[PDB]
Amino acid sequence: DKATIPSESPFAAAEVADGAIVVDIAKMKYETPELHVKVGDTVTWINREAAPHNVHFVAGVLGEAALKGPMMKKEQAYSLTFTEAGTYDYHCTPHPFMRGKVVVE
Ligand SMILES: [Cu+2]
């Protein structure tokens, strides 16, 4: 795989790790829709809205399987630690008009 998952389920926004690269989900959008990080960085999405959101990478992007992240409730967070260079597109499962990408380089 090209990312590891610290926590399979969401955790509180206040529990964000030191050094994590935060993407806010606000105004119905990934507020940083194209993020550039280095190998080994942890990206943490934080849902700021009442509507639940996730991140969803189709099969063949982060690895063989799709990575369908857990639904984050308001003020919950979810992390992926990227371990390989590449370009990784994702969307929100219930709201597929929400699109983002992580470029690892
Ligand atoms: Cu959504």
Curated annotation (Swiss-Prot):
The keyword Isomerase does not apply. Pathway: One-carbon metabolism; methylamine degradation. Cu cation binds at residues 53, 92, 95, 98. The keyword Transport applies. Keywords: Copper, Electron transport, Metal-binding, Periplasm, Signal, Transport. One of its GO terms (molecular function) is electron transfer activity. One of its GO terms (cellular component) is periplasmic space. Binds 1 copper ion per subunit. Residues 1-105 form the Plastocyanin-like domain. It is found in: Periplasm. Its cofactor is Cu cation. It comes from the Bacteria. Primary acceptor of electrons from methylamine dehydrogenase. Passes those electrons on either a soluble cytochrome c or to pseudoazurin. This is Amicyanin. The gene is mauC. The chain holds residues 27 to 131 of 131 of the full protein.
